[PDB]
């Protein structure tokens, strides 16, 4: 009944989220963020970063029905960016590019979300998230 209409609305967001995540992942610049960080080159990511994230993990989380709101999905694109700034020093040019792309990834994601997605449509998602986190 109601739970019906609900999942039709979620399925729709969940579809959009795949398309944003495909767009960010094709982008040349965001390539370093499309894999999980390796611990071969980086022998200390996990001692420095307590919550790793990447774009392919986001992909799967979409299919795992983890993102109830666009805001939830941005919570994880946001964690991509803060992870980079928290890990990489910004003196070396090499270090700096990554830093740049992380801010850019974040800004790109938000602008897309800000521009393609109907404000009325978020409100519906959030009203569904608060419902499912109850009864």
């Amino acid at each position: 009944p109601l739970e019906d209409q609900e999942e039709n609305t979620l399925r729709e967001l969940r579809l959009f989220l795949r398309d944003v995540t495909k767009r960010l992942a094709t982008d040349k610049r965001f390539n370093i963020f499309s894999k999980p960080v390796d611990i071969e080159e980086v022998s200390d990511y996990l001692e420095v970063i307590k919550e790793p994230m990447d774009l392919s993990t986001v992909i799967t989380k979409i299919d795992k029905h983890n993102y109830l709101t666009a805001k939830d999905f941005l919570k994880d694109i946001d964690l991509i960016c803060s992870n980079a700034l928290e890990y990489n020093p910004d003196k070396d040019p090499g270090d700096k590019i990554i830093r740049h792309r992380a801010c850019t990834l974040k800004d790109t994601a938000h602008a897309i979300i800000a521009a393609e997605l109907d404000p009325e449509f978020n409100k519906l998602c959030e009203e569904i998230k608060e419902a499912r986190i109850k009864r």
Partner: peptide, 7 residues
């Protein structure tokens, strides 16, 4: 800060 990616 971490050691860096490239070294």
């Amino acid at each position: 800060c971490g050691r860096g990616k490239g070294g």
